[PDB]
């Protein structure tokens, strides 16, 4: 469809087992689901230092949808990581970018079961802005108003203020979700949940001593 030629369906990737197990981080997957159901400031932007698992929270949200562990208002939603690169690519003509983004947003309103995920939401400023063309930020800023566009974002703490914050319009709509760096004890439980992925790729065995050592020595 229109969303597969731009976005990556994370919900379909979670059905096929292509997303890593996101153990822990549950209190913030369900917190993203709280923010998506709010009156205003209903767009959760996952802020956190690079590496703490901001993409993994939404990848853990996709795994929660396919397991039926979400509320019925977010049941069988399709998360799409809309990359701006596939949206700019092509577009060797006029409006090509605004109509490829209008067809994305029309497809979100038509099916109505899409939670858009914009990873690197700071990169929304200046996407497809061509000569005599409006970027992807100016196209959506409006849609956010109508609330016809619940998006999930994921920036760093630096690039949240450096951009998303400033926009005052976005402020009353985007809600910064703190994606904290986990503790060592939380990280060991992440590594235990990720044994079977890294023990199968390398066909090795990873002892419990190694994962406690991996999170402590790191």
């Amino acid at each position: 469809l229109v969303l597969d030629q731009f976005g990556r369906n994370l919900t379909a990737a979670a059905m096929e087992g292509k997303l890593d197990p996101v153990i822990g981080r549950e209190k913030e997957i369900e917190r993203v689901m709280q923010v998506l159901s709010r009156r205003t400031k209903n767009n959760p932007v996952l802020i956190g230092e690079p590496g703490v698992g901001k993409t993994a929270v939404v990848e853990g949200l996709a795994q929660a949808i396919v397991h039926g562990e979400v509320p019925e208002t977010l049941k069988d939603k399709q998360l799409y990581t809309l990359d701006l690169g596939s949206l700019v690519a092509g577009s060797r003509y006029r409006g090509d970018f605004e109509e490829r983004l209008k067809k994305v947003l029309k497809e979100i309103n038509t099916r109505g079961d899409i939670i858009l995920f914009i990873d690197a939401l700071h990169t929304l400023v200046g996407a497809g802005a061509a000569e005599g063309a409006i970027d992807a930020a100016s196209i959506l800023k409006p849609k956010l108003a109508r609330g016809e566009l619940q998006t999930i974002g994921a920036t760093t703490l630096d690039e949240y203020r450096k951009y998303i914050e400033k926009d005052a319009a976005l402020e009353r709509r985007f809600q910064p979700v703190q994606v904290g760096e986990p503790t060592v004890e939380h990280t060991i439980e992440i590594l235990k949940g990720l044994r079977d992925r890294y023990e199968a790729h390398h066909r090795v065995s990873i002892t419990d001593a190694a994962m406690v050592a991996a999170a402590t020595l790191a």
Partner: peptide
Amino acid sequence: MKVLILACLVALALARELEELNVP
């Protein structure tokens, strides 16, 4: 007794020329 007031030079440069994307 004396103090030298140094002088923290700031990095100040002219605005960047941009390269354009063409839409025919």
